[PDB]
């Protein structure tokens, strides 16, 4: 497991550590959206921070099931529940919580065990998948992850109102890669002197 940059909005060199974690705060309780990201490792996105997404640059095709583990850096006296979902290919981005639910989903209660594992199984017409990008190579898109509120973020007097969640992307034992190549990121401008 290696940390995943879901919060890849900032750019300036002071707030780069903010990429590592996304918050969760207290809300009304309507079942509202928090974050989204794709399940495409080799594609530009959150997955480039990983050692998995950098070893799929030296290999074209991939396979197997993936796993995304989350962790909660909030206070012990806090509570909440969340609805993690995996929306397979074809389907558009869900607009509400009652639409992402119809796919592969997990529900997690904040507690002693400060983590949960979402599992992204292997759903494909093909045995292998070359990497994806905008064009006709979206034939090999993996899907989407779409996090939602199930009840609320509840907390008593004295504790902070906002918390942070950290994510951790990795693979399972049926992952494979083949057809080695050279990556796009060549870290050199001129001559290394």
């Amino acid at each position: 497991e290696t940390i995943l940059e879901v919060n890849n909005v900032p750019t300036n060199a002071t707030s780069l550590m903010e990429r590592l974690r996304f918050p969760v705060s207290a809300q009304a309780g309507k079942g509202e959206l928090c974050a989204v990201f794709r399940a495409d490792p080799g594609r530009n996105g959150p997955w480039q921070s990983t050692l998995l997404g950098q070893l799929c640059g030296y290999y074209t095709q991939w396979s197997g099931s993936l796993e995304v583990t989350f962790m909660f850096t909030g206070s012990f006296m806090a509570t909440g529940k969340m609805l993690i979902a995996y929306t397979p290919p074809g389907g558009p981005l869900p607009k509400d919580r009652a639409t992402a639910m119809l796919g592969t989903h997990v529900i997690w209660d904040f507690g002693l065990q400060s983590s949960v594992t979402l599992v992204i199984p292997w759903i494909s017409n093909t045995h292998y998948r070359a990497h994806a990008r905008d064009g006709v190579f979206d034939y090999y898109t993996t899907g989407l992850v779409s996090i939602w509120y199930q009840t609320n973020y509840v907390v008593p007097i004295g504790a902070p109102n906002t918390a942070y969640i950290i994510a951790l992307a990795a693979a399972q034992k049926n992952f494979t890669m083949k057809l080695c190549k050279d990556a796009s990121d060549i870290l050199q401008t001129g001559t290394i002197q």
Binding site: G42, G57, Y58, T60, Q61, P89, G90, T126, H127, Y128, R129, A130, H131, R133, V136, F137, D138, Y139, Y140, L179, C180, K181, D182, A183, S184, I186, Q188
Partner: protein, 297 residues
């Protein structure tokens, strides 16, 4: 527990392919046997019914009087390896001195066999094909002359950085393959595996690759499966300065270890475009020749 009966007698969960037929050997044509005259009722091989959509079964023995003939004519040259494993032209890459195509000493070619119709019309008899290959590269100036020049080739798979110049950093070829070769040397020649994610190269895809509201400005992606775009083939004259000599590079493909599926008809109209079966409509020539009278040659 499967305690009901409609679950026990169910046909669900049948990973077996019920095959009516079964292959047989045939290293030679069939030996014609002897026959004699017959003057019986009922027995009548000539009268068929073709509405069923099956071919005839009448033979020389059951229509006329034949003799015994021990046929030793082989059927080995009609196989697929003996029919496809014959090299042919699939591409051309020009590296001229001063022009408009590729004057800066480099060129990218999108790997696609469908540009010359002697080899395209052989494969377009079938739909799905699974084959290794053996490319071969013939370099020469336009006059055919042979010159002392060094050359580099580099297989650029999908998702890899395409070079944009002759002095680029994509030419270090640490992980990609490459072939240095001269023109004074013989042709270069290498082998290729089956590189697809799928289980076969389909020369015909009836569908769109992506989801969406298919508007008219995105109809150019009809007939495009990315499980056949096996990448790009780059080439350049090695150096820091431009070359003294023009060049042309011709690419030949030879297929081996072949398996094919799905026979289907054969082209009769001239080809126009790639990845696209279009034909000229105002110039529909017949499948073949013509004459003046059905009652006369």
């Amino acid at each position: 527990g499967d305690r009901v009966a409609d679950v026990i007698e169910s046909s669900i969960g049948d990973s077996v392919s019920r095959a009516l037929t079964h292959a047989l050997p045939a290293p030679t044509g069939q030996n014609t046997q002897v026959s004699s005259h017959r003057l019986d009722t009922g027995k009548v091989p000539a009268l068929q019914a073709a509405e069923i959509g099956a071919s005839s079964n009448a033979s020389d023995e059951s229509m006329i009087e034949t003799r015994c003939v021990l046929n030793s004519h082989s059927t080995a040259e009609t196989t697929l390896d003996s029919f496809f494993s014959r090299a042919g032209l699939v591409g051309e890459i020009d590296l001229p001195l001063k022009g408009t195509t590729n004057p800066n000493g480099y060129a990218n070619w999108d790997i696609d066999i469908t540009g010359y119709a002697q080899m395209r019309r052989k494969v377009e008899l079938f739909t799905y094909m699974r084959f290794d290959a053996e490319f071969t590269f013939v370099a020469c100036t336009p006059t055919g002359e042979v010159v002392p020049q060094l050359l580099q080739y580099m297989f650029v798979p999908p998702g890899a950085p395409k070079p944009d110049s002759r002095e680029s950093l994509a030419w270090q070829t640490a992980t990609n393959p490459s072939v240095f070769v001269k023109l004074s040397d013989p042709p270069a020649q290498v082998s290729v595996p089956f590189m697809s994610p799928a289980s076969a190269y389909q020369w015909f895809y009836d569908g769109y690759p992506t989801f969406g509201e298919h508007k008219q400005e995105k109809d150019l992606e009809y007939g495009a499966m990315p499980n056949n775009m096996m990448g790009t083939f780059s080439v350049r004259t090695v150096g820091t300065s431009k070359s003294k000599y023009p060049l042309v590079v011709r690419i030949y493909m030879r297929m081996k270890h072949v398996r094919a599926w799905i026979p289907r008809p054969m082209r009769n109209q001239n080809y126009l475009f790639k990845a696209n079966p279009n034909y000229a409509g105002n110039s529909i020539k017949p499948t073949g020749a013509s004459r003046t009278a059905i009652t006369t040659l």
